[PDB]
Amino acid sequence: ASAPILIQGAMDVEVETLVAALKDKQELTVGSWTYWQGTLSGYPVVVSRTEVGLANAAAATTLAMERFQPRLVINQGTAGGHDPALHRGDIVIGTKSFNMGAYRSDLTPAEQGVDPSKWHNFEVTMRLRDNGKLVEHSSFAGDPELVGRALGMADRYRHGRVVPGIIGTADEWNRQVARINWLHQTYQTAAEMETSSAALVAEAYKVPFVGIRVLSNTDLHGEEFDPQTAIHCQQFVIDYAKALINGF
């Protein structure tokens, strides 16, 4: 039996198009996490609805590893823009993802108040063990061949640009524009709740991973959430997965 491609999305709107594309489906739920097992172009594919945020993403990914032993993972869905060059509908291919919500601060007394510009990325949250030995990570690189394939397919996407970028994952939805700008300037983020958590689990299991995110919103351009972007992202991802399958 052939090891499946695992394709993830957090919300119903981010998976319904993927699920509709599968043939010969069955649906499995364990705990809080649902999976649809079927085929695309005759090849096994599992679609996972992860639910939202880092804990949910890590659980859903781990459970998929244990149940399905996928050959690669595509985490996809929507995101908010951090780079002013990007607009709603543009797709970011994650050259890296990282836990943007991880914060450590030096000691300051009460009289100095609160200063988030002094909250630094706390890399221990991405530290893993490999065969028992500690391995530091400041980010997780998208598998570079998977990243490159998606960039090479850019002109197959009908609804915006496809760009490489850094995906900042956090249990956050930021709409303070000064904070978005600070995160972009500090971490070079393209967009901002699951990617790096799923990536962390994929790294632990040594399974190739790529994050593919459409901007559904950006407060840098007054562009409010458009759910149709989620459908467009899934269409691109289906094309992308079919191209991988043709190569298997």
Ligand X SMILES: CSC[C@H]1O[C@@H](n2cnc3c(N)ncnc32)[C@H](O)[C@@H]1O
Which residues here bind ligand X, judged by CB under 6 A? Answer: 10-11, 52, 77-80, 124, 173, 192-194, 216-217
Residue 246's binding partner out of ligand X, a copy of itself, none, with CB under 5 to 8 Å set by partner kind = none
Residue 79's binding partner out of ligand X, a copy of itself, none, with CB under 5 to 8 Å set by partner kind = ligand X
Which one, 146 or 215, has the nearer CB to ligand X?
A: 215
Which of 2, 20, 23, 52 touches a copy of itself (CB under 8 A)? 52
Is residue 7 a contact partner of residue 68, using CB atoms and an 8 Å limit? no
Site for a copy of itself, residues 7 to 36, rule: CB under 8 A? 29, 31-34
63 part of the interface to a copy of itself, by CB under 8 A: yes
Cα 42 → chain centroid: 26
Q: In whole angstroms, how close is the CB of 119 to a copy of itself at the nearest point?
A: 8
Report the SS3 class of residue 51. Answer: coil
Residue 126 in marked binding region:
no
Residue 217 in marked binding region:
yes
Q: In whole angstroms, how close is the CB of 242 to a copy of itself at the nearest point?
A: 28
Residue 193 in marked binding region:
yes
Site for a copy of itself, residues 82 to 121, rule: CB under 8 A? 99, 101-119
Residues 6+ apart with CB under 8 A from 174: 80, 180, 183, 192
DSSP assignment letter at 143: P
Q: How far apart are CA 158 and CA 161, in angstroms?
A: 9
Residue 32's binding partner out of ligand X, a copy of itself, none, with CB under 5 to 8 Å set by partner kind = a copy of itself
- Residue 50, phi then psi, degrees to nearest 5: -85, -15
196 part of the interface to a copy of itself, by CB under 8 A: yes
Residue 192 in marked binding region:
yes
Residues 6+ apart with CB under 8 A from 146: 72, 74, 208, 209, 210
Residues 6+ apart with CB under 8 A from 237: 7, 18, 74, 76, 212
In this structure, what token pair is assigned to residue 24? Answer: 């010969």
> Which residue from 112, 81, 108, 120 is spatially nearest to 223, judged by alpha carbons?
81
Q: In whole angstroms, how close is the CB of 201 to ligand X at the nearest point?
A: 16
Interaction mask 142-181, a copy of itself, x per CB under 8 A: ----------------------------xxxxxxxxxx-x
Q: In whole angstroms, how close is the CB of 23 to ligand X at the nearest point?
A: 27
Residues 6+ apart with CB under 8 A from 210: 72, 73, 74, 75, 93, 94, 142, 143, 146, 147, 150
Residues in contact with a copy of itself by the rule CB under 8 A:
29, 31-34, 51-59, 61-63, 65-67, 99, 101-119, 122, 124-132, 170-179, 181-182, 193, 196-197, 200-201, 204-205, 219
